[PDB]
Symmetry: D2
Subunit: 136 residues, 4 copies
């Protein structure tokens, strides 16, 4: 029974094998721990991009509201100008009538002065027609 | 008295002469002023007519000014028409850019969700592998006992 | 003295002449009154054009203030977007580093599994080197 | 006892045979498991290596997604650059239209002042003519008296 000296080598290799299976299990699990630890910063970065995307939506919404408001006010001014411009064309037309009318009135007065000069000659001849008539 | 009647007829021959040269000088002097009277009516009519000439002469410059106001009013509509075209064009283009942005930002959210799936999947796989290391270490130590309990 | 009968015609023409000089003076002055009356509506029309011109100035001033304000706000949004876009490029670069790093860590673990398979064969030969050695 | 020693040597000849075929079967059975042990270490190493293969295979799609995010970011700058060019262009043009309007409105005020002068001048001329009618009627009635006071 020289087996007692052979089996002492049996616990020496089974134990030395198991200690390597646990050192591999220890080493790998440490590597897998820190690898899986990257998940949180990765999630962090996504949340940041997510927030920046929401800012873009916020900003686009403010921009659209701003331009609409600007266009609104811009349209009111356009209408006011248009009303103001129509008012002008009307007053210019009135002034054109008042100018033509003034011309007619001036021509009437010119004609009336001519009528006066005409009827003055008619009076001069009609008066000398009495003075040459009272020559009898 | 035949000679006496002849001189009484000389009296009359000068008597009417005293009325003739007196009336001939009255109608000559009265007609000399009616003529000067018409001359004041014609010089006043000329004077006044000149005034009305230069007054009516203002009409054409008045019309020039109105016509200038007319042109400046038409320019204003021109400018108003350019301004409206410009803003319309601008709004047109701004609207495309807005749409392109929205399409681009939506595409982005898709990739962000895509990536979040890829992150969760990655975690499951890491956990799956971690479990396999635990499974190996457990079935490894339990295998050692099955050998040490028989030969020892 | 048959002049008393001639002078009665003298007051008849001097009076008839003067009454025509006053009827002309009356008629003309009436014409000149209403002609000069056009001055007030003419002045009115000018004042209206004057007010419409001031409206144009008012309107142009509002328009200039409006566009300036719009441009201001438009510039703030541009800057905010630009800051938001720079922030993105930064997070994308971080994620690219975290991806490369993750690749190195995975390769290390792959290599460490290979080292384990290698040193397992070294153990298998070294163990059978004892079992073929204890054949003596 | 010569025959007796031969059989005691047969005992030993089977005694060591009882240890030989017992040890030959112990190292054959012990080496038969060290071989199966390495086989579990190599199949686990293969199994795990597969897991790491498909996990590392996620890297390329991850890179594709980042590259898409990169392109969508560059598009956004493109769109931002078009938008700024557009508004600049628009402001440029709006500024000319504004100037042209001011020039046009100032021209107008000049004509309005021009016309107001022409209106005041017109009034002086009307008053001047009215005065001439008064002057004529006054110097006309006073002329009538100078004649009626002498002949009447």
């Amino acid at each position: 029974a020289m087996l007692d000296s052979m089996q002492e080598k049996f616990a020496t290799i089974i134990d030395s094998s198991l200690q390597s299976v646990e050192e591999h299990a220890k080493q790998m699990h440490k590597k897998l721990e820190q690898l899986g630890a990257m998940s949180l910063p990765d999630a962090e970065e996504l949340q940041n991009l997510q927030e920046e995307l929401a800012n873009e939506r916020a900003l686009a919404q403010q921009e659209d509201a701003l331009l609409e408001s600007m266009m609104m006010q811009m349209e009111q001014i356009k209408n006011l100008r248009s009303k103001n411009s129509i008012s002008m064309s009307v007053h210019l037309n009135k002034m054109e009538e008042s100018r033509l009318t003034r011309n007619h009135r001036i021509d009437d007065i010119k004609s009336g002065i001519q009528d006066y000069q005409k009827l003055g000659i008619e009076a001069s001849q009609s008066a000398q027609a009495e003075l040459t008539s009272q020559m009898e």
